[PDB]
Amino acid sequence: SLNXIX
């Protein structure tokens, strides 16, 4: 599972 930017 890859999950993204703040």
Place this chain on the structure above:
Amino acid sequence: PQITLWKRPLVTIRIGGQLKEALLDTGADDTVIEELNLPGCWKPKLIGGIAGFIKVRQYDQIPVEIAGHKAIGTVLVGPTPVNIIGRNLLTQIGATLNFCGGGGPQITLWKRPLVTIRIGGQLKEALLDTGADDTVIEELNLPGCWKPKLIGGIXGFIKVRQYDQIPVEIAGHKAIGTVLVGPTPVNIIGRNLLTQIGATLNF
């Protein structure tokens, strides 16, 4: 609804009988919510993000209502900086990405939304990511001055080089803006450029 990307695509969800705010996130395989009590049974899992891996609680077959649209699926509970609805539930509510209001291509979310970009005269593959504030590209020797910056997500923060006014063609559509360069696991096109190509979420 049709949702544009000038601001984070935050929506209200209902989950375990409670209301939460969460980001509709095409760049997430899975759905991750801050620590909370969920009726359900769970098992340990690790998931990864821009800056490394975290441990989460995996709950299966959880009902979630997302802007009034029903889904029943896996929800991961852990230390994410922002609650995120990922593709596992976006697909259940029939969410797609659309360019130019739907006059351009439609991209479904059954798999990661990877498309060809052109940057610095180089072609690369990148993820169209509504859950990214910025555009983050793998190490690439871009010309021009820059300024150091740190950007965050799951796993904490990474250091990047910020370049401004960089032309980036996305699926044949020209954009120009800030590109962050650093050790991202996946190249990411974020809202700063998705807005310029008129990309919307639709469901």
